[model samples]
Each structure stands twice: as structure tokens, then as C-alpha cells.
Target: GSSGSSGLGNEDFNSVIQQMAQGRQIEYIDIERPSTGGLGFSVVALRSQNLGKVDIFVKDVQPGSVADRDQRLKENDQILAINHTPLDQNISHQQAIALLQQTTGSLRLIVAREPVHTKSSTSGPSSG
Candidate 1:
């Protein structure tokens, strides 16, 4: 099963956010969109102090679509640049969406995502 982002208001939220801020890494992904349908994904823009700009994060990826086929693009993946233009605080929420909606032959997406982390287990304790 695939896991995704969920509500976080508990103390764990702080810890998780800290990890996200520190564990993130940049990446570049090239997506080829069909002439008919769009990129087959959704996004949300939010201001990020860490990035020093407005951040674009993937909301959901349509199944069996162009973006879905490329496993590199997924939910919570931050979109840093579209085509050759970089995104920044000057860009608005709608502006980011507008860029993704463009009907181009190919899209060069510069994105950032948190690396997968495995919990360390202490095997010294016995299980009941």
C-alpha cells in the first residue's frame, strides 16, 4: 500500500517538520506530456522560509497518466522550477499552477523531496 501525508498537529509534527526541512534534497525530472491530456498531476503553493520563496508541492498524481507513469513525480514532491524558469517568492499560487498547465512537448521539472528514512530498531528488548 502507498502511504501519504496526513494531518499533523501533535508533538510529532514538530519533529517531523524538522526532519523534512533537514532531510530534503533537490532533483530534476523530465516529464513528457501527451498532446491531449495535461501533466496528470495537481499542486499546491505555500510560502517556505527555508527555501526563501513560495514552494510548489504536488497534491496528487492521476493514475495511469503521464506523470503517474514516471514514478519520480509523486505527492508532496516540491516543484522548484518549470521548464527553465525557476520559482520564487515572486510567483503566486495561481502562477505556479499556470506554469504546470502549459501545453509543452516536454517539461523539465526541478523538484525537491525528502529522502526516505528508516526507523532505527533496538533489538535488545524482548517482545511480549
Candidate 2:
């Protein structure tokens, strides 16, 4: 979410998502939980519709929210951890929200994505 730039300090993206099957990328994102007394829009857990592994994933994101508009996360993208706490199939919607509520200012999350395959390119401007 954040990166150290020069004094002129400017960049489009701070976190870098490498093109690979599986890897880790540290994203300095800002997610505010509402139940904790901020804006009433935040995150939650989800279950599968069809009969399958039925893992809890990120359900909904606010309309035009930073998380929704940006590629930070989506309705999908399995939920693996909250901050650093491991999440599981047993976590409930309320529980997930409560856990997020505990976070002050920023809510860090770990997600499970299928994969991100991007080609390196030089555009007019770029970030992370």
C-alpha cells in the first residue's frame, strides 16, 4: 500500500504483484471497518453456492470503494487471514466483521487468488 519514494514523492501503485502461480505481495492498503465506529462499510466472509470445498471468502465490497475499484480484492479471492490471524471455514460473517472491526485505521487482509499473469510493459506512466 505504501512505498518510499523520493522527496517529490509520487507513485501510482506501491505494492507489486508478481506474475506467477503463487506468491506473496505486501500491500499497504487502507480498509476501515464500520462496526468499530467508522463508516459502516467494510468486509465479511462468504461460503460457496454449490456443493464443494465451501471455504469462506470475501463477500461484498462497497460500491466504487478503493478495494472494489482497485485490484486490491474482489467478491471472490478466498479469505486466508485477517491482519495475521488465520481464517477458516468455521468463521461466521459476524465473526469476520468483528475481527476486522478490531483493526484501527487500516485493516490488513490475506487473500487466496487463482493467479495473476501480467506482461511487463512500458506505458506513459506506471506504479509498483
Candidate 3:
């Protein structure tokens, strides 16, 4: 398979594979917010018609807050994974809230953002 006869670039594909072997390709940002401090955002659990499960989603973001500053987050952004894969599995609504509230140092969140909601005035649709 190392031969050039396979019709695939050995060096190129090998580089990506090597990178993946180190760790996940997850983007991480640290937010230092405590309960006494301000972790300014609200979330809701809504059942996705397609996903068939209640997924946590950003409901509202306060103006000029940490979440607002990041700008990566927006209302309706689905929280797919947090900290790591399956980190969100055991955390229920209150548990999630408590987790955020109890954190002192930088909090890590891995959010799956949706396209910003806009009034098409006339439209078909898309999924979150």
C-alpha cells in the first residue's frame, strides 16, 4: 500500500492519519466564569424532530457578556458535545446548569452551531 501504484498520495493521506493519532480535532476555548462571576446565557432542551431526542440549545445570549463576546455561540446553536464526546450524556437539564454554575476556571464547551435564524419572508426550511 506504500507503493505509488495505489492511485492515492501516500505522503498526503499519511500526514492526516498521523495527526488524528495524536488526539481529536476539536476546537477548544477557555471561558473563566464562576457562579459568583457571570456565565451569561440561557439554554433550553428541545426535541429535534430528526434527532428524536432532547438536545440542549442556546436560547438567549446576554449583550456584551462572555458568550456574546465569543460570537461563536448564537441562539439555537445545538450543544452536540461538551468537554469530550459523551460528556453530555449523563448531564440532564439541571445537571448541565449546575456544572456550568459550579465551574471556577476556564469552562470548556464544544457546541454545534446552527446557521443564524433569519426571516426568509418566503422559505422552505433547514435542520438545526
Candidate 4:
């Protein structure tokens, strides 16, 4: 016979509810008129499975814009950071994107042109 007074069921229910609500809280940041750029960029909010690696590729660059002369951020430079927030390797890509979309301002990125690969080619001997 099952013990009706067992505390395990109550604990499990509470844990499930907490987990569901963890990602629902919205974080908002204020944007001033001067920095809004006439709302050129769309505000995005959604859940995703993988944001994918921050590949180097300029989505767009307006001429005479403040970001036009940033040589470090070329048209195809990979983004390693957004607004000084470094991404965690263990976290899913969706989580990383969520962090980026939730914030507002002049986003800064650590640029990298190429991605680092861990796989070794068959033509070469294994380094290890």
C-alpha cells in the first residue's frame, strides 16, 4: 500500500512548477530617443533550440553610420560577445540569443573570423 502522507509527491510538484516559471520572467531595458535609430532594428522575443554559433557575417552596415568605421568588426567578423556578455559553451544557443535580445544599446562584440574545430583530418596524425 502507498503511504498517502509521503512528502515526495509534494516536493516533486513544487519543483516542476518552479522550473516552468524560471524562463518566463521578462527583462526590459530602456532606450533613449537618440539611440533608438528610428527603430531600424526590430525587437525580437521568442524561444529557440539553437541560436547557432556566432558566425562572422555582417547582417547589414549603414554607410556613414557610427559602426561603419569599426575595422575590428568587419562585414564578416564572428561575434563572440554582445554588450560585454560572454557566452557559455555549455549553454544552448537559444539561451545565448535570449540574453542578447533582452538587452538594448550599442552592442559590442569580440570578433573572430574563423571558427575553431576540434576534429582532426585523416591525412594528419592525431596530435594527442
Candidate 5:
């Protein structure tokens, strides 16, 4: 769930879910230290991708959901880390998924969004 440099895509995300559906076993978990968000949390991979990116576009947020009230975590907020371990892009997406499933307690995140540009600026002097 740690959104690595390569942003999350569609196919990669779905594959993670499919693997979960198959009931694959998981191993140990690494803490995502130096994480933007706090600790004691973990991320669940809902999709898969070769690139190391995480998409936080949430489908829904229940009124009294754990993320809604306590965590204050927002939807569409890409996760950067769990505990404190940063995600590794070199590894397979499945490995990332395993990291999430194995993790225990609260998690932290580092998120980024595309900034809105209202107007375009000329890089150099424009010739009229």
C-alpha cells in the first residue's frame, strides 16, 4: 500500500485483490518508519502494478468509519508507508501487498496530489 515513486495503475491494483481472493498466506511485516503519517497502522492492497505507486482514491467513507473519525485519513490520499518502512519499487507488486497484509496496528502515509494550475505561464520572453 506504500505508494512508491511510480504511481498506482489499474491492472496492478486489481491483481492484488485477486491474490487476496485466492487466500494467499503472508509473512512478516516491516514498519514504515520516517512515514508522513503516524504509526501502528497498515495498508491493504486493493490493486496491483509494476510501478511502485499507490492510489488513494477511496470508493466510500462511512460516516463513522475508522478512517473518517479517528484516523482522520482521507480518501484518495496515497499511502507512503506503513509503520515506517518505505515501499520498494524494485520488488514485485505482490511483495508490496504482502508487506501490507502482514503489518499490524496503525499505519502512516505520505501522500501527494497533482496541483491545479489555473493559468499557463510562458517559460521565456514571448514573441508577439
Candidate 6:
């Protein structure tokens, strides 16, 4: 039984739950697996016992892991799917662990999280 508590970053956990309920601000991240190494990240599930819904989120990322290399993945990012498989509400903790551990090659992840950067300062200007 993997049991650990997370504060869900600086933002309140309640607000994050509210955001996920609305299904907004999810992002796609692509990370390549090495020939002989793990994904280098762990995940935790936030289950809604009343609604029977499950939410998977990144627990921690290793400093030099594949996920860290992607530079887009971070702790507290909600994992919506792996590859092309939709991780629906029915998924269990063990099921998710198996799915992620057995996956290979390029892992395409759909995740939801608050913007890491508040400033959307794209230096390049595009004028029509």
C-alpha cells in the first residue's frame, strides 16, 4: 500500500479538484524511454470514493530521468492518459501502475495542471 500525502503545490488542493472537474488546461507531453531504464517518475491517485472516480497525478520526478528530460513534466500534474489509452474513472491504483511500468518506446501523456509559468511571454512576435 503506497500511502503518502501531497499538498498539491502552492495552490489549494480544493481548487485543483475544482479545475479537474471542469476538465480544463490539460497538456500533452511526449517522453522517450531509454533502451534499458525506467520512466524515472512515480504517481499517486486521488480517488473520489463517493463518485467512484480516480485521478492519477505525478508524485515525483527523478533529477536525470526520462520525464525530467522532457522538461514539461512536473510533480502534481494530473495524468489523464498514457499513450492513446484513456484512463477513465474506473481505473485502480494497481492498474495504472501496471500500465505505466509496462509501457515502452515513446510515452505520450495527457496531463492537466496549472500553468507552470504565469508569464506567457513568447519573445517572438507574429504579425499579420
lDDT of each residue in 1-128, candidate 3, tens digit only: 11334433543433432332234333443465655557688878765443234566667778677876754455665555444332232344555555666666666655542233575557676799
Error of 3 at 29 (Å): 5.3
TM-score against truth, every candidate: 0.64, 0.45, 0.52, 0.36, 0.39, 0.66
lDDT of 1: 0.67
Q: Over the stretch 12-78, how does candidate 6's per-residue lDDT look in tens digits?
A: 4445434453646767778786788878888887885545667788877887787886656878877
Predicted model with the maximum TM-score = 6
Against the true structure, candidate 4 reaches a TM-score of 0.36
Q: What's the lDDT for all of these models?
A: 0.67, 0.47, 0.52, 0.38, 0.42, 0.69
Sort by TM-score, top down from the best: 6, 1, 3, 2, 5, 4
Looking at model 4, the pairs that clash are 56-76, 56-77, 56-78
lDDT of 4 by residue, 9-39 (tens): 5445334323322333312122222254421
Off by over 4 Å in 5: 1-59, 119-128
- Among the numbered candidates, top lDDT falls to 6
Q: Candidate 2 lDDT (Cα, whole model)?
A: 0.47
How many clashing residue pairs are found in candidate 3? 0
lDDT of 2 at 117: 60
Over the stretch 1-128, how does candidate 1's per-residue lDDT look in tens digits? 22345653442533533343455676777888778778888887688875446778887778778887764676787776677555654455677777777748887777766565695655595689
Model 2 regions more than 4 Å off: 1-54, 69-71, 89-94, 116-128
Off by over 4 Å in 6: 1-21, 115-128
Lowest summed lDDT across 10 adjacent residues in model 5 is found at 25-34
Residue 57, candidate 2: C-alpha displacement in angstroms? 1.8
Candidate 5 lDDT over residue span 22-127, tens digit each: 3322222223322343333334444436455443332354435445445554444444333444343434445555555555454344433344377575568568
Tens-place lDDT digits, model 2, residues 24-115: 44333345543434423445344544322234455555556655454355555455556654443334455666766567766766665553
